[PDB]
Amino acid sequence: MVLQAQEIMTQNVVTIRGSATVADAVKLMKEKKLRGLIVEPRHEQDPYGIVTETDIVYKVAAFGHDPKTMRVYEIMAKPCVVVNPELGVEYVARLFAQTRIRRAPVIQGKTLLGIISVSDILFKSDFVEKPKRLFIEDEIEAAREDARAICAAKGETSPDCAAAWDVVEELQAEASH
């Protein structure tokens, strides 16, 4: 059974309103050692948002702006990239790499469950013991079509036929390992 986002997420998740001051966000973040706060939907159809340590440092501290007057809505990401609780941990890694984020709320429908970060992955994913070759089932399926085509064209007992099924075999050994 593939390890899931919900299994490694930080379960204690804290929200803040978009209208709050960056100072409020900072105080909350220091008090609980949080590197991301989820921004509270204002109603059922309103997306989730997120404000991160990197937003705060890059957009506020780096320009010497005053966090006591700046608001969260001015720095947050809303809507933000979200993670399904069932999403396998190799996919959460890939999402984060592709969208260039380090952190996302874990959301089931409209319901906030947690927050998942690069740190959650580093510290709690099974990627060292169980590295999952991405899309390996698509590779197997493609390689089986190649083998069938080659075998039907060149003969079911030809060396190229055998070599093409050996590509399938190797990919299949890896997946069930």
Q: Where are the alpha helices (DSSP H) in the chain?
A: 5-8, 22-32, 53-59, 89-99, 118-124, 136-154, 159-176
Handedness of CA 140, 143, 149, 155 (dihedral sign): negative
Distance CA 107, CA 79 (A): 13
Q: Interface with a copy of itself by CB under 8 A: which range of 7-15, 119-127, 151-159, 164-172?
A: 119-127
For residue 27, state whether it binds a copy of itself (rule: CB under 8 A). yes
- Compose the 30-59 pattern: x for residues touching a copy of itself by CB under 8 A, - for all others: x--x-x------x-xxxx-----xx-xxx-
- Nearest distance from C-beta of residue 23 to Cl ion, angstroms: 19
Among 17, 35, 59, 144, interactor with Cl ion by CB under 5 A: 35
For residue 68, state whether it binds a copy of itself (rule: CB under 8 A). yes
Contacted by 121, from a copy of itself, Cl ion, none: CB < 5 to 8 Å by type:
a copy of itself
Q: Which is nearer to Cl ion, 48 or 165 (CB)?
A: 48
The single residue listed with the structure tokens 């959301």 is 107
Distance CA 128, CA 59 (A): 35
Q: Which of residues 69-128 bind Cl ion (CB under 5 A)?
A: 102-103, 117, 119
Distance CA 119, CA 89 (A): 12
Distance CA 111, CA 38 (A): 12
- Nearest distance from C-beta of residue 108 to Cl ion, angstroms: 20
- Nearest distance from C-beta of residue 163 to a copy of itself, angstroms: 16
For residue 99, state whether it binds a copy of itself (rule: CB under 8 A). yes
Among 65, 112, 151, 172, interactor with a copy of itself by CB under 8 A: 65
Distance CA 103, CA 80 (A): 10
